[PDB]
Write a protein that binds this ligand. Structure first.
Ligand SMILES: [K+]
Lengths: 74, 74
Protein backbone atom coordinates (compact mmCIF):
# COMPACT_ATOMS: atom_id res chain seq x y z
CA UNK A 1 0.00 0.00 0.00
CA UNK A 2 0.99 3.65 0.50
CA UNK A 3 3.90 3.36 2.97
CA UNK A 4 5.51 0.73 0.66
CA UNK A 5 5.05 3.23 -2.19
CA UNK A 6 6.76 6.11 -0.38
CA UNK A 7 9.73 3.89 0.65
CA UNK A 8 9.98 2.60 -2.90
CA UNK A 9 9.73 6.06 -4.39
CA UNK A 10 12.46 7.18 -1.99
CA UNK A 11 14.78 4.25 -2.98
CA UNK A 12 14.22 4.87 -6.70
CA UNK A 13 15.04 8.54 -6.33
CA UNK A 14 18.27 7.67 -4.44
CA UNK A 15 19.25 5.13 -7.07
CA UNK A 16 18.90 7.77 -9.77
CA UNK A 17 20.94 10.22 -7.74
CA UNK A 18 23.74 7.88 -7.36
CA UNK A 19 23.62 7.22 -11.09
CA UNK A 20 23.63 10.91 -11.99
CA UNK A 21 26.33 11.75 -9.40
CA UNK A 22 28.57 8.96 -10.55
CA UNK A 23 28.25 10.06 -14.15
CA UNK A 24 29.02 13.63 -13.11
CA UNK A 25 32.14 12.53 -11.08
CA UNK A 26 33.44 10.74 -14.16
CA UNK A 27 33.85 13.99 -15.99
CA UNK A 28 36.22 15.80 -13.50
CA UNK A 29 38.19 12.54 -13.26
CA UNK A 30 38.70 12.41 -17.04
CA UNK A 31 39.64 16.11 -17.02
CA UNK A 32 42.29 15.60 -14.35
CA UNK A 33 43.67 12.58 -16.27
CA UNK A 34 43.73 14.23 -19.60
CA UNK A 35 45.30 17.45 -18.44
CA UNK A 36 47.87 15.59 -16.38
CA UNK A 37 48.90 13.64 -19.46
CA UNK A 38 49.23 16.70 -21.69
CA UNK A 39 51.42 18.38 -19.06
CA UNK A 40 53.64 15.39 -18.54
CA UNK A 41 54.15 15.17 -22.32
CA UNK A 42 55.37 18.77 -22.51
CA UNK A 43 52.54 19.93 -24.63
CA UNK A 44 51.40 22.62 -22.14
CA UNK A 45 52.55 25.58 -20.08
CA UNK A 46 51.69 26.98 -16.56
CA UNK A 47 51.71 24.22 -14.18
CA UNK A 48 49.89 26.49 -11.74
CA UNK A 49 46.89 26.37 -14.09
CA UNK A 50 47.00 22.58 -14.17
CA UNK A 51 47.05 22.47 -10.34
CA UNK A 52 44.32 25.13 -10.12
CA UNK A 53 42.17 23.14 -12.45
CA UNK A 54 42.76 19.97 -10.35
CA UNK A 55 41.77 22.07 -7.24
CA UNK A 56 38.60 23.21 -8.89
CA UNK A 57 37.52 19.78 -10.14
CA UNK A 58 38.28 18.31 -6.69
CA UNK A 59 36.17 20.96 -4.98
CA UNK A 60 33.29 20.23 -7.31
CA UNK A 61 33.58 16.52 -6.66
CA UNK A 62 33.56 17.29 -2.88
CA UNK A 63 30.19 18.94 -3.21
CA UNK A 64 28.78 16.03 -5.18
CA UNK A 65 30.01 13.49 -2.66
CA UNK A 66 28.61 15.51 0.26
CA UNK A 67 25.31 15.86 -1.52
CA UNK A 68 25.04 12.05 -1.61
CA UNK A 69 25.95 11.69 2.02
CA UNK A 70 23.30 14.26 2.97
CA UNK A 71 20.67 12.68 0.76
CA UNK A 72 21.22 9.45 2.58
CA UNK A 73 20.43 11.14 5.87
CA UNK A 74 17.29 12.87 4.72
CA UNK B 1 2.32 -4.22 7.02
CA UNK B 2 4.70 -6.66 5.40
CA UNK B 3 5.03 -4.63 2.24
CA UNK B 4 5.96 -1.51 4.05
CA UNK B 5 8.40 -3.26 6.28
CA UNK B 6 10.26 -4.93 3.27
CA UNK B 7 10.18 -1.71 1.39
CA UNK B 8 11.67 0.27 4.30
CA UNK B 9 14.30 -2.35 4.77
CA UNK B 10 15.22 -2.05 1.12
CA UNK B 11 15.27 1.76 1.37
CA UNK B 12 17.45 1.77 4.47
CA UNK B 13 19.99 -0.61 2.84
CA UNK B 14 20.11 1.79 -0.19
CA UNK B 15 20.78 4.65 2.25
CA UNK B 16 23.51 2.62 4.03
CA UNK B 17 25.02 1.72 0.63
CA UNK B 18 25.01 5.37 -0.45
CA UNK B 19 26.71 6.43 2.81
CA UNK B 20 29.46 3.75 2.47
CA UNK B 21 30.09 4.42 -1.10
CA UNK B 22 30.35 8.10 -0.59
CA UNK B 23 32.79 7.86 2.28
CA UNK B 24 34.91 5.60 0.13
CA UNK B 25 35.08 8.34 -2.53
CA UNK B 26 35.80 10.92 0.02
CA UNK B 27 39.04 9.49 1.09
CA UNK B 28 40.96 9.61 -2.20
CA UNK B 29 39.37 13.05 -2.86
CA UNK B 30 40.75 14.60 0.34
CA UNK B 31 44.17 13.44 -0.84
CA UNK B 32 43.86 15.11 -4.26
CA UNK B 33 42.65 18.27 -2.56
CA UNK B 34 45.25 18.26 0.10
CA UNK B 35 48.04 17.79 -2.40
CA UNK B 36 46.78 20.64 -4.56
CA UNK B 37 46.63 22.94 -1.56
CA UNK B 38 50.26 22.03 -0.77
CA UNK B 39 51.15 23.30 -4.12
CA UNK B 40 49.17 26.49 -3.78
CA UNK B 41 50.89 27.18 -0.41
CA UNK B 42 54.33 27.15 -2.22
CA UNK B 43 55.28 23.93 -0.39
CA UNK B 44 55.80 21.59 -3.47
CA UNK B 45 59.42 20.96 -4.47
CA UNK B 46 58.74 17.83 -6.67
CA UNK B 47 55.48 18.47 -8.43
CA UNK B 48 55.96 15.30 -10.46
CA UNK B 49 55.63 13.23 -7.34
CA UNK B 50 52.70 15.32 -6.15
CA UNK B 51 51.02 14.83 -9.54
CA UNK B 52 51.69 11.14 -9.55
CA UNK B 53 49.85 10.68 -6.28
CA UNK B 54 47.05 12.81 -7.58
CA UNK B 55 46.80 10.70 -10.71
CA UNK B 56 46.84 7.53 -8.71
CA UNK B 57 43.98 8.66 -6.45
CA UNK B 58 41.98 9.86 -9.46
CA UNK B 59 42.34 6.46 -11.12
CA UNK B 60 41.36 4.75 -7.89
CA UNK B 61 38.20 6.88 -7.75
CA UNK B 62 37.60 6.18 -11.32
CA UNK B 63 37.28 2.57 -10.60
CA UNK B 64 35.09 3.14 -7.57
CA UNK B 65 32.82 5.31 -9.67
CA UNK B 66 32.58 2.78 -12.51
CA UNK B 67 31.61 0.15 -10.01
CA UNK B 68 28.99 2.39 -8.43
CA UNK B 69 27.48 2.99 -11.85
CA UNK B 70 27.16 -0.79 -12.32
CA UNK B 71 25.80 -1.42 -8.83
CA UNK B 72 23.13 1.22 -9.16
CA UNK B 73 21.62 -1.00 -11.84
CA UNK B 74 21.33 -4.07 -9.58
K1 LIG C 1 20.15 -2.84 -4.88
Amino acid sequence: GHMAEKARDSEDRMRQFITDASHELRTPLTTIRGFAELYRQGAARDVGMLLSRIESEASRMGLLVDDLLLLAKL
